[PDB]
């Protein structure tokens, strides 16, 4: 039992929501959206089913990603300290859409998938309470 | 001074390749390309351009691997609801960097294929 249009898996309330916002932005349109939402974080083998079932079943209609809750919180756009050859990597010219730093899901892989993206995409999304 | 097979730059030798390995093999392959080699570290845009300028000359248009793996791999990541990363349904294990001979931009593909590499070591 969860609002109206929410569906339930154990204890937690799923919306998929087809509007195409950044990560940052799908992030903070679920907080607004119940009391505690957040974007889906997949905790469990059968919660990732569930979503994938969902989402399938509700924003498969124009071929993207869905994003998920996972980043990392940090502004590295690499975390590997260092070179083959033991040097400080200190010096950068990344394309940033080539950071992919934020996660999403995709149809390609069945909606069951992890897929590193860039988190200034607009993709659709799963928010969960 | 460099091998009669090597480009010198400020110091240092580097010299492309065109059997793609996947990233550890590539790094391991540079190893034995000489005393202290490795894959290419780009310490800067000047020694980037000059890397650029030269996988370019020689096989013209392809991608290169790099000195960078394991980036985003041991990245804090965690979930928006403050949980840690404990499940995992990663797509991919782990990201390498590698540039292309058309600009000197740094890329990223999964570590575990293949592309060229350039291979360096000073003096
Ligand atoms: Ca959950
Ligand atoms: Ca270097």
Redo the contacts with the bound molecule.
């Keep these: 039992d969860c609002p109206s249009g929410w569906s339930s898996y154990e204890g937690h309330c799923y919306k998929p929501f087809k509007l195409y916002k950044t990560w940052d932005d799908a992030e903070r349109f679920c907080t607004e959206q119940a009391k505690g939402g957040h974007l889906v974080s997949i905790e469990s083998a059968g919660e990732a089913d569930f979503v994938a079932q969902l989402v399938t079943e509700n924003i498969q209609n124009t071929k993207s990603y869905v994003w998920i809750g996972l980043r990392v919180q940090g502004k590295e756009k690499q975390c590997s300290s260092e070179w083959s050859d033991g040097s400080s990597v200190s010096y950068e010219n990344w394309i940033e859409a080539e950071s992919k730093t934020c996660l999403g899901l995709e149809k390609e892989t069945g909606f069951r998938k992890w897929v590193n993206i860039y988190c200034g995409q607009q993709n659709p999304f799963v928010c969960e309470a | 001074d460099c091998p009669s097979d090597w480009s010198s730059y400020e110091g240092?030798c580097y010299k492309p390749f065109s059997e793609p390995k996947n990233w550890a093999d590539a790094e391991n392959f540079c190893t034995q390309q000489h005393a202290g080699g490795h894959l290419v570290?780009?310490?800067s845009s000047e020694?980037a351009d000059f890397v650029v300028k030269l996988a370019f000359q020689t096989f013209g248009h392809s991608i290169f691997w790099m000195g960078l793996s394991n980036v985003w791999n041991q990245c804090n990541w965690q979930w928006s609801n403050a949980a840690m990363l404990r499940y995992k349904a990663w797509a991919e294990e782990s990201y390498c960097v590698y540039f292309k001979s058309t600009n000197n931009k740094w890329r990223s593909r999964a570590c575990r294929m293949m592309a060229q590499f350039v291979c360096?070591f000073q003096a």
């Design positions: 240092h570290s780009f310490q020694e360096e």
